[PDB]
Amino acid sequence: GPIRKVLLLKEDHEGLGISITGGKEHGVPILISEIHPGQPADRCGGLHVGDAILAVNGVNLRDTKHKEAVTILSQQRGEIEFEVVYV
Template sequence: MATTTSSYTRTGVLEVYAKQQWHKVLATLEEDHLSLCLDESYEVPPITNNGTLSDSEPSDIPESIANTKRVVRVVKQDNNGLGISIKGGKENKMPILISKIFKGMAADTTEQLYVGDAILSVNGEDLRDATHDEAVRALKRAGKVVDLE
Protein backbone atom coordinates (compact mmCIF):
# COMPACT_ATOMS: atom_id res chain seq x y z
CA MET A 1 0.00 0.00 0.00
CA ALA A 2 1.37 3.42 -0.93
CA THR A 3 1.18 5.66 2.08
CA THR A 4 1.66 9.21 3.19
CA THR A 5 1.96 9.99 6.84
CA SER A 6 1.42 12.86 9.22
CA SER A 7 1.59 12.81 12.98
CA TYR A 8 -1.84 11.20 13.41
CA THR A 9 -3.00 10.20 9.93
CA ARG A 10 -1.98 7.56 7.39
CA THR A 11 -3.54 7.44 3.95
CA GLY A 12 -3.13 4.96 1.14
CA VAL A 13 -4.79 2.87 -1.52
CA LEU A 14 -5.84 -0.70 -0.81
CA GLU A 15 -8.11 -3.33 -2.31
CA VAL A 16 -11.31 -4.41 -0.55
CA TYR A 17 -13.38 -7.47 -1.47
CA ALA A 18 -17.06 -6.53 -1.43
CA LYS A 19 -20.12 -7.62 -3.40
CA GLN A 20 -18.18 -10.48 -5.02
CA GLN A 21 -15.41 -8.32 -6.53
CA TRP A 22 -12.29 -6.36 -5.60
CA HIS A 23 -12.45 -2.56 -5.34
CA LYS A 24 -9.63 -0.03 -4.94
CA VAL A 25 -10.38 2.32 -2.07
CA LEU A 26 -8.64 5.22 -0.43
CA ALA A 27 -8.06 4.27 3.21
CA THR A 28 -7.41 6.88 5.88
CA LEU A 29 -6.29 5.76 9.33
CA GLU A 30 -6.65 8.47 11.92
CA GLU A 31 -5.93 8.36 15.61
CA ASP A 32 -9.22 6.71 16.57
CA HIS A 33 -10.82 5.42 13.35
CA LEU A 34 -10.34 4.02 9.84
CA SER A 35 -12.32 5.39 6.90
CA LEU A 36 -12.60 3.88 3.42
CA CYS A 37 -13.57 5.94 0.39
CA LEU A 38 -14.64 4.49 -2.95
CA ASP A 39 -14.54 7.95 -4.52
CA GLU A 40 -12.71 7.47 -7.82
CA SER A 41 -11.95 11.17 -8.25
CA TYR A 42 -8.77 11.07 -6.17
CA GLU A 43 -5.34 10.71 -7.76
CA VAL A 44 -3.87 7.28 -7.14
CA PRO A 45 -0.13 7.48 -6.42
CA PRO A 46 2.13 4.76 -7.83
CA ILE A 47 1.73 1.63 -5.69
CA THR A 48 4.91 0.30 -4.16
CA ASN A 49 5.88 -3.27 -3.49
CA ASN A 50 8.49 -3.61 -0.77
CA GLY A 51 9.63 -0.06 -1.46
CA THR A 52 9.98 -0.41 -5.24
CA LEU A 53 7.66 0.99 -7.85
CA SER A 54 5.29 -1.54 -9.32
CA ASP A 55 3.82 -1.51 -12.81
CA SER A 56 1.30 -4.17 -11.93
CA GLU A 57 -1.80 -2.00 -12.10
CA PRO A 58 -4.87 -4.03 -12.96
CA SER A 59 -5.35 -4.38 -16.70
CA ASP A 60 -8.54 -3.42 -18.48
CA ILE A 61 -10.39 -6.72 -18.37
CA PRO A 62 -12.95 -6.97 -21.19
CA GLU A 63 -16.50 -6.62 -19.86
CA SER A 64 -17.48 -9.89 -21.57
CA ILE A 65 -15.19 -11.94 -19.29
CA ALA A 66 -15.06 -9.84 -16.11
CA ASN A 67 -16.17 -11.85 -13.06
CA THR A 68 -16.58 -15.07 -15.05
CA LYS A 69 -14.78 -18.39 -14.57
CA ARG A 70 -12.66 -19.51 -17.48
CA VAL A 71 -9.84 -21.95 -18.17
CA VAL A 72 -6.76 -20.63 -19.97
CA ARG A 73 -4.17 -23.04 -21.35
CA VAL A 74 -0.63 -21.68 -21.19
CA VAL A 75 2.20 -23.49 -22.99
CA LYS A 76 5.58 -22.60 -21.52
CA GLN A 77 8.39 -21.73 -23.87
CA ASP A 78 11.62 -23.73 -23.62
CA ASN A 79 13.62 -22.90 -20.48
CA ASN A 80 11.14 -20.23 -19.37
CA GLY A 81 8.41 -20.04 -16.77
CA LEU A 82 4.83 -18.89 -17.12
CA GLY A 83 5.79 -15.24 -16.92
CA ILE A 84 3.50 -14.22 -14.05
CA SER A 85 3.85 -13.07 -10.48
CA ILE A 86 1.17 -13.82 -7.92
CA LYS A 87 0.00 -12.35 -4.64
CA GLY A 88 -2.48 -13.39 -2.00
CA GLY A 89 -3.15 -16.72 -0.35
CA LYS A 90 -4.95 -18.14 2.65
CA GLU A 91 -2.62 -16.44 5.14
CA ASN A 92 -3.49 -13.07 3.57
CA LYS A 93 -7.23 -13.83 3.60
CA MET A 94 -7.43 -13.29 -0.15
CA PRO A 95 -7.45 -15.46 -3.27
CA ILE A 96 -4.36 -16.14 -5.35
CA LEU A 97 -4.23 -13.23 -7.79
CA ILE A 98 -2.05 -12.47 -10.80
CA SER A 99 -0.06 -9.38 -9.77
CA LYS A 100 2.16 -9.05 -12.85
CA ILE A 101 2.35 -10.48 -16.38
CA PHE A 102 5.76 -10.28 -18.02
CA LYS A 103 5.73 -9.07 -21.63
CA GLY A 104 6.58 -11.68 -24.25
CA MET A 105 6.42 -14.61 -21.85
CA ALA A 106 3.98 -17.55 -22.13
CA ALA A 107 1.12 -16.06 -20.09
CA ASP A 108 1.33 -12.79 -22.01
CA THR A 109 1.23 -14.50 -25.40
CA THR A 110 -2.13 -16.12 -24.60
CA GLU A 111 -3.70 -12.64 -24.49
CA GLN A 112 -6.31 -14.20 -22.17
CA LEU A 113 -4.86 -13.44 -18.72
CA TYR A 114 -5.02 -10.13 -16.88
CA VAL A 115 -3.48 -8.58 -13.78
CA GLY A 116 -6.07 -9.08 -11.04
CA ASP A 117 -7.30 -12.45 -12.34
CA ALA A 118 -7.82 -14.97 -9.54
CA ILE A 119 -6.21 -18.39 -10.06
CA LEU A 120 -8.69 -20.95 -8.74
CA SER A 121 -6.79 -24.05 -9.88
CA VAL A 122 -3.63 -25.16 -11.68
CA ASN A 123 -4.02 -28.28 -13.85
CA GLY A 124 -7.04 -29.24 -11.76
CA GLU A 125 -5.31 -28.70 -8.38
CA ASP A 126 -7.63 -26.50 -6.33
CA LEU A 127 -5.97 -23.33 -5.00
CA ARG A 128 -9.05 -21.73 -3.42
CA ASP A 129 -7.75 -22.51 0.09
CA ALA A 130 -4.01 -22.47 -0.74
CA THR A 131 -1.33 -20.44 0.98
CA HIS A 132 0.90 -18.28 -1.20
CA ASP A 133 3.75 -20.82 -0.94
CA GLU A 134 1.45 -23.72 -1.88
CA ALA A 135 0.31 -21.80 -4.96
CA VAL A 136 3.90 -21.04 -5.98
CA ARG A 137 4.79 -24.74 -5.66
CA ALA A 138 1.73 -25.77 -7.72
CA LEU A 139 2.69 -23.34 -10.48
CA LYS A 140 6.34 -24.47 -10.49
CA ARG A 141 5.53 -28.18 -10.76
CA ALA A 142 2.79 -27.71 -13.37
CA GLY A 143 4.86 -28.82 -16.36
CA LYS A 144 5.07 -27.41 -19.88
CA VAL A 145 1.30 -27.21 -20.48
CA VAL A 146 -0.56 -25.40 -17.71
CA ASP A 147 -4.33 -25.05 -17.42
CA LEU A 148 -5.27 -22.11 -15.20
CA GLU A 149 -8.85 -21.75 -14.00
Protein backbone atom coordinates in the same frame (compact mmCIF):
# COMPACT_ATOMS: atom_id res chain seq x y z
CA GLY B 1 -16.89 -11.89 -13.85
CA PRO B 2 -17.34 -15.35 -15.32
CA ILE B 3 -15.06 -18.21 -14.46
CA ARG B 4 -12.81 -18.89 -17.44
CA LYS B 5 -10.62 -21.80 -18.49
CA VAL B 6 -7.34 -20.65 -20.05
CA LEU B 7 -4.64 -22.72 -21.79
CA LEU B 8 -1.00 -21.70 -21.37
CA LEU B 9 1.94 -23.19 -23.31
CA LYS B 10 5.43 -23.05 -21.90
CA GLU B 11 8.80 -24.58 -22.57
CA ASP B 12 10.99 -25.94 -19.81
CA HIS B 13 13.54 -23.09 -19.89
CA GLU B 14 10.93 -20.49 -18.92
CA GLY B 15 8.77 -19.58 -15.96
CA LEU B 16 5.05 -18.86 -16.24
CA GLY B 17 5.69 -15.15 -16.66
CA ILE B 18 3.42 -13.97 -13.84
CA SER B 19 3.78 -12.47 -10.40
CA ILE B 20 1.28 -13.60 -7.79
CA THR B 21 0.22 -12.10 -4.49
CA GLY B 22 -2.06 -13.17 -1.66
CA GLY B 23 -2.85 -16.52 -0.13
CA LYS B 24 -5.10 -18.17 2.44
CA GLU B 25 -2.99 -17.02 5.39
CA HIS B 26 -3.71 -13.41 4.31
CA GLY B 27 -7.43 -13.90 3.68
CA VAL B 28 -6.91 -13.05 0.00
CA PRO B 29 -7.09 -15.14 -3.22
CA ILE B 30 -4.02 -16.01 -5.26
CA LEU B 31 -4.08 -12.96 -7.56
CA ILE B 32 -2.05 -12.21 -10.67
CA SER B 33 -0.29 -8.93 -9.92
CA GLU B 34 2.05 -8.85 -12.93
CA ILE B 35 2.22 -10.36 -16.42
CA HIS B 36 5.75 -10.20 -17.81
CA PRO B 37 5.77 -9.10 -21.47
CA GLY B 38 6.74 -11.77 -23.96
CA GLN B 39 6.66 -14.65 -21.45
CA PRO B 40 4.18 -17.58 -21.53
CA ALA B 41 1.24 -15.95 -19.72
CA ASP B 42 1.42 -12.87 -21.95
CA ARG B 43 1.72 -15.05 -25.06
CA CYS B 44 -1.27 -17.19 -24.11
CA GLY B 45 -3.60 -14.17 -24.38
CA GLY B 46 -6.09 -15.21 -21.72
CA LEU B 47 -4.55 -14.19 -18.37
CA HIS B 48 -4.66 -10.66 -16.98
CA VAL B 49 -3.52 -8.62 -13.99
CA GLY B 50 -6.23 -8.86 -11.35
CA ASP B 51 -7.29 -12.41 -12.27
CA ALA B 52 -7.71 -14.76 -9.34
CA ILE B 53 -6.20 -18.22 -10.01
CA LEU B 54 -8.83 -20.67 -8.86
CA ALA B 55 -7.14 -23.86 -10.07
CA VAL B 56 -4.24 -25.07 -12.18
CA ASN B 57 -4.33 -28.45 -13.97
CA GLY B 58 -7.22 -29.46 -11.72
CA VAL B 59 -5.43 -28.52 -8.47
CA ASN B 60 -7.63 -26.17 -6.43
CA LEU B 61 -5.86 -23.01 -5.25
CA ARG B 62 -8.77 -21.30 -3.53
CA ASP B 63 -7.66 -22.42 -0.03
CA THR B 64 -3.91 -22.36 -0.59
CA LYS B 65 -1.24 -20.46 1.31
CA HIS B 66 1.13 -18.27 -0.68
CA LYS B 67 4.14 -20.59 -0.74
CA GLU B 68 1.94 -23.65 -1.32
CA ALA B 69 0.62 -21.91 -4.45
CA VAL B 70 4.15 -21.08 -5.60
CA THR B 71 5.26 -24.72 -5.33
CA ILE B 72 2.13 -26.00 -7.10
CA LEU B 73 2.29 -23.43 -9.89
CA SER B 74 6.03 -23.77 -10.51
CA GLN B 75 5.74 -27.58 -10.84
CA GLN B 76 3.44 -27.47 -13.86
CA ARG B 77 5.04 -28.06 -17.27
CA GLY B 78 4.13 -27.84 -20.93
CA GLU B 79 0.43 -27.38 -21.69
CA ILE B 80 -1.08 -25.92 -18.51
CA GLU B 81 -4.81 -25.34 -17.89
CA PHE B 82 -5.81 -22.42 -15.65
CA GLU B 83 -9.19 -21.75 -14.09
CA VAL B 84 -9.39 -18.00 -13.41
CA VAL B 85 -11.86 -15.23 -12.68
CA TYR B 86 -11.67 -11.45 -12.74
CA VAL B 87 -13.38 -9.71 -9.82
